[PDB]
Amino acid sequence: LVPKRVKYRREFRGNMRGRAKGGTEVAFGEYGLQAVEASWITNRQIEAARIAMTRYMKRGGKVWIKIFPHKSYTSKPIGVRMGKGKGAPEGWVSPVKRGKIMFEIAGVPEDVAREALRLAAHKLPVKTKIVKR
Amino acid sequence: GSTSNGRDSESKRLGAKRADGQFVTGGSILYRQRGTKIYPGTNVGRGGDDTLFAKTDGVVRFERMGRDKKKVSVYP
Amino acid sequence: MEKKVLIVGISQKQKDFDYSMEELANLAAANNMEVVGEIRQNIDRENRATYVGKGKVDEIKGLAEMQDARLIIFNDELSPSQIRNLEEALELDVMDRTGLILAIFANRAKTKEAQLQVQIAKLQYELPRIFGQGEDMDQQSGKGGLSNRGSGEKKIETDRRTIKHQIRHLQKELDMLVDDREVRRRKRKKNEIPVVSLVGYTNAGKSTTMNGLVRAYSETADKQVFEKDMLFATLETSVREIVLPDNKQFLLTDTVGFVSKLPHQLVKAFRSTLEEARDADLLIHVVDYSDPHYKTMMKTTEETLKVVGVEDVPVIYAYNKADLLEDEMYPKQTGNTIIFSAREEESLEFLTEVIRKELFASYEKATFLIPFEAGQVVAYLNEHADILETEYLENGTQIVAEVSPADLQKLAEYQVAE
RNA sequence: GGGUAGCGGAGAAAUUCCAAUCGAACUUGGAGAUAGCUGGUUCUCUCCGAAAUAGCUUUAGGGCUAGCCUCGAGGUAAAGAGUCAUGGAGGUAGAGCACUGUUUGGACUAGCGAAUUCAGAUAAACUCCGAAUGCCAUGUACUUAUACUCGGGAGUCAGACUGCGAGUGAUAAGAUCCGUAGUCGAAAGGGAAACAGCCCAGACCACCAGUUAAGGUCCCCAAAUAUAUGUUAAGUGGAAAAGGAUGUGGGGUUGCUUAGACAACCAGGAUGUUGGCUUAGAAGCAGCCACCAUUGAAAGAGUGCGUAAUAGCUCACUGGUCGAGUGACCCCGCGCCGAAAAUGUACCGGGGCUAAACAUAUUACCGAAACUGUGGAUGAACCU
RNA sequence: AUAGGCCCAGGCGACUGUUUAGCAAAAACACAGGUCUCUGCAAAACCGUAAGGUGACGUAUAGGGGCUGACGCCUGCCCGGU
RNA sequence: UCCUAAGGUAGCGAAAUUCCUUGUCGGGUAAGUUCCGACCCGCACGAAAGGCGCAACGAUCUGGGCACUGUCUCAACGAGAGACUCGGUGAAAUUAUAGUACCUGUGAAGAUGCAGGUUACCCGCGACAGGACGGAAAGACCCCGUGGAGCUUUACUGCAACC
RNA sequence: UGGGGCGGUCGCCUCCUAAAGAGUAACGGAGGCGCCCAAAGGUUCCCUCAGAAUGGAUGGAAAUCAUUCGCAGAGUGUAAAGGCACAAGGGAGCUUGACUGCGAGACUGACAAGUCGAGCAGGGACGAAAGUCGGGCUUAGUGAUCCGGUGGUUCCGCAUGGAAGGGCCAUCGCUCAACGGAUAAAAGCUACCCCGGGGAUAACAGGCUUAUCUCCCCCAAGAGUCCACAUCGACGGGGAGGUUUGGCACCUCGAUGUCGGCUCGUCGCAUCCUGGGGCUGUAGUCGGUCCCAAGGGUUGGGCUGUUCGCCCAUUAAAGCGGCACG
RNA sequence: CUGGUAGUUAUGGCGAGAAGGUCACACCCGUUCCCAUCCCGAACACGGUAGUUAAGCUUCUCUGCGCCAAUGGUAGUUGGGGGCUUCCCCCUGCGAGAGUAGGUCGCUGCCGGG
Ligand SMILES: Nc1nc2c(ncn2[C@@H]2O[C@H](COP(=O)(O)OP(=O)(O)CP(=O)(O)O)[C@@H](O)[C@H]2O)c(=O)[nH]1
Ligand SMILES: [K+]
Ligand SMILES: [Mg+2]
Ligand SMILES: [Mg+2]
Ligand SMILES: [Mg+2]
Ligand SMILES: [Mg+2]
Ligand SMILES: [Mg+2]
Ligand SMILES: [Mg+2]
Ligand SMILES: [Mg+2]
Ligand SMILES: [Mg+2]
Ligand SMILES: [Mg+2]
Ligand SMILES: [Mg+2]
Ligand SMILES: [Mg+2]
Ligand SMILES: [Mg+2]
Ligand SMILES: [Mg+2]
Ligand SMILES: [Mg+2]
Ligand SMILES: [Mg+2]
Ligand SMILES: [Mg+2]
Ligand SMILES: [Mg+2]
Ligand SMILES: [Mg+2]
Ligand SMILES: [Mg+2]
Ligand SMILES: [Mg+2]
Ligand SMILES: [Mg+2]
Ligand SMILES: [Mg+2]
Ligand SMILES: [Mg+2]
Ligand SMILES: [Mg+2]
Ligand SMILES: [Mg+2]
Ligand SMILES: [Mg+2]
Ligand SMILES: [Mg+2]
Ligand SMILES: [Mg+2]
Ligand SMILES: [Mg+2]
Ligand SMILES: [Mg+2]
Ligand SMILES: [Mg+2]
Ligand SMILES: [Mg+2]
Ligand SMILES: [Mg+2]
Ligand SMILES: [Mg+2]
Ligand SMILES: [Mg+2]
Ligand SMILES: [Mg+2]
Ligand SMILES: [Mg+2]
Ligand SMILES: [Mg+2]
Ligand SMILES: [Mg+2]
Ligand SMILES: [Mg+2]
Ligand SMILES: [Mg+2]
Ligand SMILES: [Mg+2]
Ligand SMILES: [Mg+2]
Ligand SMILES: [Mg+2]
Ligand SMILES: [Mg+2]
Ligand SMILES: [Mg+2]
Ligand SMILES: [Mg+2]
Ligand SMILES: [Mg+2]
Ligand SMILES: [Mg+2]
Ligand SMILES: [Mg+2]
């Protein structure tokens, strides 16, 4: 998941104070993963979690991803000093505040849903919980 | 490594130069702006680069014309 | 997205030089790159400084700047000085065939055995090239004088030592992994199951043959092996049981494909991987008979087997894709050659018949008399050997069947003389 | 015994030699060369007391003007500071999708797919909205002591850490660069074991007087082996995460039970029938399709072990003996594992502690150069 | 008591000689030989303001300067630029 | 065929020259990143700043042998001169005052001297060097100063000399 | 100037950072300027844009025409921001105010400079008056002094009349771009080097940090002849250590000797051998993996200055690290 | 009652449904004249009034859109104090945006005519 184009190539890192602005309720499916803490979540982590939870269900039901990696971050190589401008972009990240629902699923029974969400939550750097509509 | 940035312009010190309810003398500058962010009112003139100035002696009043706009006047 | 590349080649007295550029274009198309132009030069010797000569460099630069390319790919291995010169002359990025194959292998390496192999191959390839690459920073001309305080060494020694060190660590991890791998072969070696291995060129049809055989003669036949045209599809070896209708057991293994003009830093990885084929009991050489160039392929195939170190193993040359050819009959056996189509029941029947004929040849006739109350041996005979006829006698069961020497020795008490 | 003399001589050439001196000898003079650099600069007490910033600079460890200190003198329609009331300018935090970018799932679609709609997201350089604070004025309100102008004399232009708001960096650094407040600098005293910058608090002098602050009250070591109600068993307290777990306490739901529950003990656990197919077999228990009926309290076309198939063992289920509870889930408190480094215990200052630990509430005392008591010295302003 | 250790093979410099008094003895300098160039005699060149000198009490088979460095085989193409 | 003033000839070549490089093959050794002989993809040889050879010569540099041995395995004994004790004579570098332990910590971030602990009767003589960031020499490296000196040139401005 | 060098930059304008007044730094994130216009200036009068649907020859999705919807989705010389539909946008008529002398009072500001300005006088342009006009919707489009050139002038003019020469007013001559401009005029080497200073600032070691590094784990798709967990384990996730490659510049420049070896060791345990054990894809033999365990032990040579490494021959074994790389 | 002309943050607007009149207003008829069209008496200008409320205009009714808008809660935050510091918690004062109860089919002034 990468944006097709951006207005600017560099951006401030921001902060993560407060509860999530919107998206704190299950709105499309029956089950969801909710963030209990705040964290940067990259697109590799999203992809790994999605593949795990989709493979467990054998391509049955539906999955909604409720977060997008809009923000970019940069870096500097080993051996360069401080200064001489900002570094080059590396990846894309989504800042997720506490209370945000980040994955929803539908179309499967209790056991399959809960086990798929448990398998997905182990790929993520944030502390999660499972909620039902 | 190079930045290719680093330029800026000198600040121009815009905004309100006198207070609401203050007594002011003729010719005093009341407000500096780009465009008519505030309009000239009674006894107030608009300069060539949009500067608002007092034309007489009196007290400054910032007022609200029709819903979306503002103006400033000077009353003896 | 997709990068625009160019491919550059010299005749170099190669016998074909055309299939080489074709497969180079195919390899580029397997790395999310597309060929927007090729340059060839018919020079019998390679230029020492730029690999193509002075004028060809300008021609290549003009074509790249007209076609808007981002990288140049050279058909042969380059030299560090050649790379420096070409990069300075072209003001672009330069890459060679070895780098391309390493790039193909790196992103298809899933199991960490392959990942570590590609990692060590990449570091070995880049180790000689760092000299002039790092000299630009190192050759700062002005650094100092005598100091009475310092490292007692020159920077070149220090960075040489640093780059030398990590190679040993990576190779050590490789060796530990291979030693751990030898543990999982203990059961196979302790027993004496015959092993037959499929080898050949890429996209020959090895995986399809294995999948057909597994579907025909396996218990857990749902265990299939991936198949596709693409490129190096299988990067790992697989082992499966095959049990024949006459109650015989063997193990079938599948390995990776290779291509011509193979790097020497990666042939070590292939030699590590083909260690199962090295200790095989039978070899099956799959050849794409449809392709006109198939003949050339066969030769280069043996070359690879000559380098990894597998020899003196009986080989049956199987010619796949018989259905794609008109006016041909199959399956057919001629000497040690088989003509057949992998996606056929009858072709697989013929191939497995040939395999059974070749491997098992010491199964001779023998007659046994198993007493009734002292039974539980007829079950062993029926589940470990193929029977012909049995009789219900008053004193017991009189069986006749064809068996192996181990069964004869184990059942030596029940034999009856004639 | 003689010749070549320093803007010079000699050199089979090394910057080699020209009186222990040579990329340009020695001596005297110009001469006290110049040194925006380092070092040094000698008696006492009283009052006040900084800066480490802006701009320009062949400027960057130098200077100049301004800012900040001190001394003297002036003038008032009292101009300085705090709070209160009132009026304004201004788009940050938050929020939102009305514009602009980024973006998810449907319906519909010009033709897999542009638009329209439905629902749902996101923003330093988006805004239909929009604070708290801070800022500018007015007042006759209440309190409080400066403010300004002119002149003489300066020093300063390396700052540091801590809290809060940002950038850079890796949402590293006792990092770097700004904004805002504090302390150090230039500040002693008490507490943090020791410990510029943290917490408390500003030393005029003397006393073998009192009360308090932060921090404390078992011994080192001054003061509680204090009071009440609970928690913890790790020395947790006195170091460390994702994950893992019948530790332990407090709540809230729910099933069965003295017409007998749960656990053990006794007995039964059968018949068509080896259900059909497949297999050399397949008899409940390799595998596929079915899962009925009878007696009876119940008893599976079988829960597991066992044979090669059997055989054999066991369970589901029912009756019998004793007669009190028993089994599922949710929330909260404190604990457990994960947990490894180099001279010597060495991750409470020590001894030691099961409270001398933790939670809630309460009350005495100790504790400073703070404040008070008594006696001295001294500056300013204003009065007699 | 005093009185050569020897052999095989390679780089460099032909050789004897000279050198950084007091850190470097050499593969560096010199060298015999080669070649280019200047100079008709009050020679060119060099010292000196000059006078006066060296060259030389010499006269192109002589004298000054540059480069190479015994000897053997050799020393190719370019006169656009300076 | 394009361009150039013209496109490196002979000879030699992993070299006092080769980055990759311990190039590849062979010799020599049980084992040879050095050495010798070949090869030629000469990063970046080359013809009087001479190319390639060469008998004799060298306190030159490099590799291998015979002989020889305390160089070594691995050290032992003996002689003399100092050291050591006694009589005579008698300095120096250095030095803020000193009744001058160890461990863990703290601190301008590496403590004899600060904290908490652990050891420790007073004064010497012969030895050894872990510390006193030991002594000696206002760091030669590095940076700075609108410091200096020697040298270069198609830097600037000059001067001699010559035409 | 996160040592100096290399690279980049040096003056002016617009936005973000900037914390809702103004101001505010970094070799922080983004873009422009060194002009143009004789109308694209002044005034008087008039009126309104982009796009879409529909209907029609060449004509086509889009050229011209007609109706309807249409708050600006257009335009505004040019970058951006703030403005503007009572136009500051678009047409037409007449014009030269893109005037001369000034200027109460303010903004900005160390200075030098920069910005706004009602109103007064002279003489005008356009309008029937009222009235507007000292360039352009606003904010960039620029360079001090000294020295020279040109035009004007009821100024001076070394005994006197003139003249030569000056003064005053207007204007011209700078990539003086290192843009407050040292001179009218200026590039390099020092390993032959010297003096004054600095831990204000680099090279060794110490300190902080832990991206990288070494080690240990969580989930479990897969491999393992069936079989996630004998042995391994992808995509992702979490820590410990302080030996690597780095970052910072806190002690030391009135000196903290810097690689390898030799001599002499001592400590940690993440254990190379030996001792005890659990699991095994443990029949036996030979092994694999994990737990306890630091008592002792842990080789001689060839090549290379080497550490490392490769090779020869052994051994029960030929451990890995700290101590100023002891 | 109507014509003209002002003020007032759309509670005043958009949309829909009807009534009315040459007293005023307008549409309408014409182009000799002043004046006009990059062409057109459409508009502008002028000269009259056969027909008309069809439209503008005036009056009345609708909440469909639009606009206005509480209360309580929540976010944020000045000051004071703590943690286990990607951040969080407590006390005091201030206090949104969104959403909603509800409001709205205007209200005031001067002049000339009926
Ligand atoms: N007509 C025909 N096509 C065949 C036959 N056998 C195989 N193919 C085709 O050739 C392809 C073979 O692919 P595959 O067997 O996976 O190649 P591979 O050998 O595994 C390549 P790798 O070495 O990377 O594993 C298949 O996609 C199949 O469609 C045949 O007998 N006839
Ligand atoms: K998680
Ligand atoms: Mg150097
Ligand atoms: Mg001299
Ligand atoms: Mg010499
Ligand atoms: Mg000398
Ligand atoms: Mg100072
Ligand atoms: Mg101090
Ligand atoms: Mg203190
Ligand atoms: Mg008690
Ligand atoms: Mg985890
Ligand atoms: Mg609990
Ligand atoms: Mg029971
Ligand atoms: Mg614990
Ligand atoms: Mg713990
Ligand atoms: Mg523990
Ligand atoms: Mg601790
Ligand atoms: Mg205690
Ligand atoms: Mg008193
Ligand atoms: Mg007193
Ligand atoms: Mg007094
Ligand atoms: Mg010499
Ligand atoms: Mg001769
Ligand atoms: Mg000569
Ligand atoms: Mg003579
Ligand atoms: Mg001559
Ligand atoms: Mg000469
Ligand atoms: Mg020459
Ligand atoms: Mg000769
Ligand atoms: Mg060899
Ligand atoms: Mg050899
Ligand atoms: Mg050789
Ligand atoms: Mg030679
Ligand atoms: Mg010779
Ligand atoms: Mg010879
Ligand atoms: Mg001789
Ligand atoms: Mg000789
Ligand atoms: Mg004596
Ligand atoms: Mg003596
Ligand atoms: Mg002590
Ligand atoms: Mg003593
Ligand atoms: Mg200077
Ligand atoms: Mg000198
Ligand atoms: Mg205009
Ligand atoms: Mg000048
Ligand atoms: Mg030199
Ligand atoms: Mg270092
Ligand atoms: Mg260090
Ligand atoms: Mg010093
Ligand atoms: Mg050796
Ligand atoms: Mg052994
Ligand atoms: Mg060490």
- Closest-lying ligand 1 atom to the alpha carbon of residue C205: 15
Ligand 1, atom 26: closest residue by C-alpha: C228
CB distance B19 to B31 below 8 Å: no
Question: Where do the domains of chain C lie, and which CATH numbers do they carry?
Answer: 4-105 (3.40.50.11060), 169-359 (3.40.50.300)
Positive or negative, the Cα torsion across C271, C275, C279, C282? negative
| Degrees to nearest 5, angle at CA C144 with C143 and C145 | 145
Q: Quick one: DSSP state of residue C12?
A: T
**Cα–Cα distance, C70 to C148 (Å, whole number):** 49
Q: Which of C312, C355, C353, C341 is nearest to C204 (CA)?
A: C341
Token readout for C48 is 């020492």
CB distance A101 to A25 below 8 Å: yes
Q: Quick one: DSSP state of residue C149?
A: S
Q: Quick one: DSSP state of residue C349?
A: H
Question: Could you tell me which residues are beta bridge partners of residue C6?
Answer: C72
CA–centroid distance, C295 to ligand 13, in Å, is 79
Token readout for C269 is 């990885």
Distance from residue A17's CA to nucleotide D132's C1', rounded to whole Å: 18
How far from C158 is each of B46, C80, C147, C164, C370, CA to CA, in Å? 73, 21, 18, 10, 79
Burial class (CB in 10 A: 0-12, 13-18, 19+), B33: middle
Q: Which of A52, A41, A29, A47 is nearest to A118 (CA)?
A: A52
Token readout for B43 is 């006894």
**Cα–Cα distance, C348 to C354 (Å, whole number):** 10
CB distance C129 to C83 below 8 Å: yes
**Cα–Cα distance, C360 to C229 (Å, whole number):** 34
**Cα–Cα distance, C349 to C107 (Å, whole number):** 38
- Mutation to probe ligand 1, out of C27, C104, C208, C256 (largest number of atoms < 8 A from CB): C208
Token readout for C43 is 């020079």
Q: Which amino acid is at C137?
A: M
Ligand 1 binding pocket, CB closer than 6 Å: C 202-208, 227-229, 232-234, 256-257, 320-321, 323-324, 341-343
Q: Which residue of A has its CA nearest to B3?
A: A85
Way it was determined: cryo-EM
ω into C292 cis (within 30 of 0): no
Positive or negative, the Cα torsion across A28, A30, A32, A36? positive
Residue with token string 């006198």: B18
* Residues near C190 by beta carbon (within 8 Å), at least 6 away in sequence: none
Token readout for B45 is 């003139």
- Nucleic strand H under 7 Å from the C-beta of B64: yes
**Cα–Cα distance, A133 to A106 (Å, whole number):** 10
Positive or negative, the Cα torsion across B51, B56, B61, B64? negative
CB distance C401 to C414 below 8 Å: no
Q: Which of B8, B9, B54 is nearest to B31 (CA)?
A: B54
